[PDB]
Ligand binder design. Structure first.
Ligand SMILES: [Co+2]
Ligand SMILES: [Co+2]
Ligand SMILES: [Co+2]
Ligand SMILES: [Co+2]
Lengths: 324, 324
């Protein structure tokens, strides 16, 4: 009936139009060490955050799930400030990034002491039911991620703990797949440990452009997300054209009730500011929160997708997802 | 004649008896993500920190070099407070940990933008001559680290950036070698890039029992450091007896002006508290800051090492390294 947000519990019946995967703040593990030259300009970040939030509300968005990992600059207190100033419902997460590019030394160590999984589970429980640090803010989703072509042994501890925290709380699990791989695998592993398919969102599915891969994942009964619209070139990612084609093939097969969309934007980059080289800066031109509403959805309508299906993805699916 | 401490420039000839490598605080990359169950406890951490500084004091230590990497919990301000309640001179560093136990994603990204090396140099330069964050405290040494059996491309970035900064500033470079490898390699790589050998210290040299390996490293004219006394248990990694036996050989061959000692203790672990399995635990029972003065030095004296060589290592060498 309710889900935890940065401002406290909110009736699931009130989430409304939802972007399932966006980042107000984000930093690659290691930015913390570049504090001297890559300081966090609080007020400016919030200005940028707030504008982004306002651009979403301008298109009907009422809720955003910001799944920024514990080791990537998660900052509930800052999210709360954005929520207080915009009225936007913001749901944060608990979880670590994938091994390829996260901060694994800490828990790899506890793995030697043979307590990692229990410690992780203890962490998920605490952030899901008591609060994150001394902020009083609880996380609404468990964030998981796997590497390219494999779910490492390090990542499996997080998956097992996730399934266990989910059995206990009925918390939603959101995942990150790397370069269109491991979708079916993530679902199988999570289900094999008792996780509830109706509470799982396998992310970055748009990373694979072969519908049989999607169908193979959809068969486990989970939700999947085409959440990187706008990201082009970088990460051997596909194109928005390919994304649409794949999405169209699924919508026509009748999978609308298992599909969600988002951009996966990074509104304020943590650490030192950088600028992307000419070639890529161009292909990423549409990587912003208004992209789905200004370019993608109009495109889907010309292709015959009707309003009822769009509402199912942006309002109905999130509603079902967050309610047992 | 002066060196930067967490309390500003101090005169080199006033450093006195020194421990070249100790950590008041340390946390493995990822500790930050476990903030909820592993919150930092100021008051208490400060109690252990100072108590540790007081025990060192009992034995004549007036100066400690705390090279905690930027991504491993370095906290100049905290160090600053320990110095105030003890008077003890504390020199901190600027640098990142090696690939395996560090937070590589952040600078791996800049690397793709062909800017890592130059950014790292910018960071070193900034922390050695202006201040760390808004602490006003300048680092007094650059910390470098390489992995087992090799200096990866990620690590060579910091080495190059480090040689470049040593030239322009005359700053000391202190290193970490993993499992007794790469000492001669690191020294060669740094010298072959302009660094000054009398301003370098190859660390964890006590990691290799073969005295020849040391002769190789010492032949470059650099200082080496047996800085892990007390650490035994990696089952295959050096015991103190082997360390002593190796120290004795090199001192007897006349290499006293190039050697320094320490424990590499971690006084306050960052993240959630833990406990070593009883076999290892009882085997690391001498890993504290008094081990050198209560066991090692007495044992070296019982083997014929004269008071004047001990002073050369503890006072004369640190004075020469930093006097430049
Ligand atoms: Co992701
Ligand atoms: Co994301
Ligand atoms: Co070390
Ligand atoms: Co160390």
């Amino acid at each position: 009936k309710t889900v935890e947000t940065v401002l406290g519990p909110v009736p699931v019946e009130q989430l409304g139009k939802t972007l399932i995967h966006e980042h107000f703040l984000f930093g690659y593990p290691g930015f913390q060490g570049d504090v001297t030259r890559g300081t966090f300009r609080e007020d400016e970040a919030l200005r940028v955050a707030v504008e982004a939030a306002e651009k979403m509300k301008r298109h009907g968005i009422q809720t955003v799930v910001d799944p920024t990992p514990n080791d990537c600059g998660r900052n509930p207190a800052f999210l709360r400030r954005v929520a207080e100033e915009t009225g936007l419902n913001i749901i944060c997460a608990t979880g670590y990034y994938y091994e390829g590019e996260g901060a694994p030394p800490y828990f790899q160590f506890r793995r030697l002491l043979g307590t990692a999984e229990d410690d992780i589970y203890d962490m998920f429980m605490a952030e899901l039911t008591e609060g994150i640090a001394d902020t009083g803010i609880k996380a609404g989703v468990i964030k998981l991620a796997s590497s390219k072509g494999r779910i490492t042994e390090y990542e499996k501890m997080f998956f097992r703990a996730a399934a266990r925290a989910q059995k206990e709380t009925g918390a939603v699990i959101i995942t990150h797949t790397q370069e269109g791989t491991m979708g079916p695998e993530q679902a199988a592993y999570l289900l094999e440990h008792g996780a509830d398919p109706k509470k799982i969102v396998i992310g970055h599915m748009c990373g694979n452009t072969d519908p049989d891969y999607h169908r193979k994942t959809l068969a486990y009964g989970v939700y999947i997300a085409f959440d990187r619209f706008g990201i082009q070139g970088m990460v051997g990612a596909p194109t928005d054209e390919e994304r649409v084609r794949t999405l169209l093939a699924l919508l026509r097969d009748g999978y609308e009730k298992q599909i969600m969309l988002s951009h996966d934007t990074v509104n304020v980059w943590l650490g030192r500011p950088f600028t992307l080289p000419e070639p890529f800066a161009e292909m990423m031109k549409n990587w912003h929160v208004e992209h789905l509403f200004v370019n993608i959805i109009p495109a889907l309508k010309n292709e015959g997708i009707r309003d009822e299906v769009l509402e199912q993805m942006f309002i109905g699916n999130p509603a079902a997802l967050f309610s047992a």
